[PDB]
């Protein structure tokens, strides 16, 4: 093998099937672990009288002769952890009076003979974890009074009887975690003095064991993954030296008001899900706590003495309770993190966080805090994170928050004022309820959750001077030419054919669209470079609602009147219906009105952007409304197209030809202008392709009101009917 000068051989992994020969008799550590040895013959170690450490782990060992290990009076460590022994080699390990460590971990041991571990008068560590043991070997373990470490972890043990570990007086560590233990008698842990660690993690425990009372030296207790529901008072009466108590993942309802009490050395208390608890624990004597967590409970108050004692408290988590009032945190000089989210706290007083130095993280989200005192955070020391999201706030103080690195206020929709950026000089992250409140910080560089972008303009509403002049020209042309067309058409008020009526009504709808465009232009002019100060007010007030109603009404009324005009042209081409068409026009106007008013009864429609347009900017909100409007307009345009195609196909009407071509031009231009609006409305809801919001805003501002100015100029320039009507108006005025 790999013989070494220091008398420590390493035969591991050589594949041999016996004890190697030709080795020095002065060796003191032999490793024959990985090679496959299936048995140990008699006097297999007669050439190693000076062994002090024998490793046989990982062989396919299945039989050890009773005299195989005879003569190893100097053996101190024996490893057999990963072999195929089905039992404790009771006869083989006899006569090993100097053994101190014995490993039997992964052997499929199912039976422990009653005379096992006899003569092992120096044994101190025993491994029996990953076998298949159904009972604790009481009598075999009674032969090991010097044992100091013991593990029975992965066995199939279901219960522990009384006095199981009576003679284990020197035992220090006991592992029993991954057994299916469900029954612990009151005297099972009797005689277990000097025991410091007890592991009962993954057992099927039902109630809290009372056998712990006989463990005065216990320092660490683990029972976390059991099904324990109630921890009674005086549960740890007999364990004054406990430092760690693992109890998470137990389905817990009640913990008792004095379960944790007079535990001087306990450093962390974490309880979650204890719903039936409604009183803050009595922790007198437990003054060395550094972390306290009581998440899921019905606690309504915090004792004023929480900081008078618990001088070393660092982290406080009282989140998912229902706490109404906050006590004075005077004291708690070591407290760093406070988590009070998801409670029901309605106000923050001036002295709520009085003193309280070294407070770095403070969480107050999901509460009902409608009032924060101006100097509430004034006395705080170095504070980094502040979270007051979803708290129903109208004002936010700024004193003492210059050192913040992260602020969160996302859910306070009543907080409409603008945060001054001269206070949060060290700010690096921010969340605000509205995208216009992050204007004062722009882009050290701060990152703000609701992006300013292009559909929440910070300085100029319309944008560049090019778009501004385009929209101004569109507004003026639409207004003046629509007024001209309306006045000329309705000046005679004597003969009103269906085509004349439809032209006039389309002009009226275009005039309303021009009024909406003028609203936008005047708002952009008045808020020139300061639209941050106007955005919240405009989007939350009635102005955006009025503008959105005007825009939607104008567009839908134009579409419906155009469809009615196409139907009328088809009817006239095929072959006394003026009353019917008047009623149809009234119905179309009513439908446009109800479609425009529907977003008012809906919520979140007209506040998507300062353009007050519901569908173009928004894709995820109001998806049904956007889809319905887009599909309705597309179906109307398809009907117009098929009607025009049929009319052209079947018809070969000198007076009617002018109206036919005018309506064809109207439907052509309106459909051409509408299709990009629908495309851009559907664009942002698809993640495959990205389209710049700036181009979206510009194309919407240009094409949405474009028909309202293109139609009247077409009618004025290219209609002999308009020419003769203008002549009639001239005769009327003169």
């Amino acid at each position: 093998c790999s013989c070494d000068g220091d008398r420590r051989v390493d035969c591991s992994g050589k594949g041999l099937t016996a004890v190697p020969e030709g080795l020095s008799a002065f060796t003191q550590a032999l490793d024959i672990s990985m090679n496959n040895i299936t048995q140990l013959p008699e006097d297999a170690f007669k050439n190693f009288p000076f062994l002090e450490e024998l490793q046989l782990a990982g062989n396919d060992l299945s039989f050890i002769h009773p005299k195989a290990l005879s003569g190893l009076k100097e053996l101190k460590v024996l490893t057999l952890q990963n072999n195929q022994l089905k039992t404790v080699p009771s006869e083989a390990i006899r006569g090993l009076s100097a053994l101190q460590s014995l490993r039997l971990d992964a052997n499929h041991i199912t039976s422990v003979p009653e005379d096992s571990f006899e003569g092992l008068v120096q044994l101190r560590h025993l491994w029996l974890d990953d076998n298949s043991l159904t009972e604790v070997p009481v009598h075999p373990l009674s032969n090991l009074p010097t044992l100091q470490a013991l593990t029975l972890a992965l066995n199939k043990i279901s219960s522990i009887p009384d006095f199981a570990f009576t003679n284990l007086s020197s035992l220090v560590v006991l592992h029993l975690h991954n057994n299916k233990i469900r029954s612990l008698s009151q005297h099972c842990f009797d005689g277990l003095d000097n025991l410091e660690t007890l592991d009962l993690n993954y057992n099927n425990l039902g109630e809290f064991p009372q056998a712990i009372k006989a463990l005065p030296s216990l320092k660490e207790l683990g029972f976390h993954s059991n099904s324990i529901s109630v921890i009674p008072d005086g549960a740890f009466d007999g364990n004054p030296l406990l430092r760690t108590i693992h109890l998470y993942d137990n389905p817990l309802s009640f913990v008792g008001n004095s379960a944790f009490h007079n535990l001087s050395d306990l450093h962390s208390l974490v309880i979650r899900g204890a719903s039936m608890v409604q009183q803050f624990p009595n922790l007198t004597g437990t003054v060395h706590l550094e972390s306290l967590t009581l998440t899921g409970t019905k606690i309504s108050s915090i004792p004023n003495n929480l900081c008078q004692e618990q001088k070393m408290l660092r982290t406080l988590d009282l989140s998912y309770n229902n706490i109404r009032d906050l006590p004075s945190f005077n004291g708690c000089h070591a407290l760093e993190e406070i988590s009070l989210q998801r409670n029901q706290i309605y106000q923050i007083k001036e002295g709520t966080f009085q003193g309280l130095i070294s407070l770095r993280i403070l969480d107050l989200s999901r509460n009902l805090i409608h009032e924060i005192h101006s100097r509430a955070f004034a006395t705080l020391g170095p504070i980094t994170n502040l979270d007051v999201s979803f708290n129903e706030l109208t004002s936010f103080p700024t004193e003492g928050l210059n050192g913040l690195n992260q602020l969160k206020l996302v859910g306070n929709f009543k907080l409409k004022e603008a945060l001054a950026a001269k206070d949060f000089v060290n700010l690096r992250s921010l969340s605000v309820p509205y995208a216009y409140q992050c204007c004062a910080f722009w882009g050290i560089i701060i990152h703000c959750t609701p992006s300013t972008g292009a559909f929440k303009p910070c300085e100029y509403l319309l944008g560049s001077w090019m778009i501004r002049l385009t929209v101004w020209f569109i507004f003026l042309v639409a207004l003046f030419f629509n007024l001209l067309v309306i006045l000329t058409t309705f000046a005679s008020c004597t003969s009103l054919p269906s085509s004349k009526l439809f032209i006039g009504l389309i002009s009226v709808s275009n005039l309303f669209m021009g009024i909406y465009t003028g609203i936008l232009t005047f708002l952009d002019a008045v808020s020139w470079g300061r639209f941050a100060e106007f955005g919240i007010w405009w989007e939350t007030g009635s102005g955006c609602k009025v503008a959105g109603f005007l825009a939607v009404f104008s567009s839908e009324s134009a579409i419906f009147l155009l469809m009615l005009a196409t139907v009328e042209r088809s009817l006239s081409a095929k072959d006394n219906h003026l009353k019917q068409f008047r009623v149809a026009a009234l119905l179309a106007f009513l439908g446009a009105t109800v479609a425009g008013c529907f977003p008012l009864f809906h919520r979140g429609e007209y506040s998507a952007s300062p353009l007050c347009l519901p569908f173009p900017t928004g894709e995820t909100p109001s998806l049904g409304f956007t889809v319905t409007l887009v599909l309705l307009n597309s179906l109307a345009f398809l009907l117009m197209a098929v009607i025009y195609t049929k009319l052209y196909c079947n018809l070969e009407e000198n007076s009617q030809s002018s109206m036919i071509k005018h309506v064809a031009w109207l439907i052509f231009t309106n459909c051409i202008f509408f299709c990009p609006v629908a495309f851009f409305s559907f664009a942002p809801l698809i993640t495959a392709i990205s389209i710049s919001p700036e181009i979206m805003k510009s194309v919407t501002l240009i094409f949405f009101p474009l028909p309202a100015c293109l139609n009247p100029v077409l009618y004025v320039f290219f209609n002999p009917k308009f020419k003769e009507d203008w002549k009639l108006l001239k005769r009327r005025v003169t």
Partner: nanobody, 108 residues
Framework: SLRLSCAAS????????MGWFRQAPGKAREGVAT???????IYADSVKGRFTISQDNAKNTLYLQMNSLKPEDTAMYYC???????????????????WGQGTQVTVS
């Protein structure tokens, strides 16, 4: 139909918890028939009825009678003894203190 005979010519007295074991090449030694000093006998599941164990202290021998040797009965057979007391008798190889040489039993 074989008859295995085991002789104990060295132990002074008190033949306690004798038994028979069979082994396949490279596998564990599985008990087949164990006799207590009071005459109580414990057999394996695949052994009872077919085999029989008889300890005679007049000649101080141990007999294993084998009947209807199925083809999966070929192995190496050992006899084990335990002069000392203090354990419940059974088919566990770990409790016995003395072992025999063993004979190769093949179906024939």
């Amino acid at each position: 139909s074989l008859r295995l005979s085991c002789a104990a010519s060295g132990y002074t007295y008190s033949p306690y918890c004798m038994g028979w074991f069979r082994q396949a090449p490279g596998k564990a030694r599985e008990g087949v028939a164990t006799v207590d000093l009071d005459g109580s006998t414990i057999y394996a599941d695949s052994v009872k009825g077919r085999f029989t164990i008889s300890q005679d202290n007049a000649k101080n021998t141990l007999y294993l009678q084998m009947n209807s040797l199925k083809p999966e009965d070929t192995a190496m057979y050992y006899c084990a003894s335990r002069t000392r007391a203090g354990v419940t008798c059974g088919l566990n190889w770990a409790i016995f203190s003395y072992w025999g040489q063993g004979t190769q039993v093949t179906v024939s």
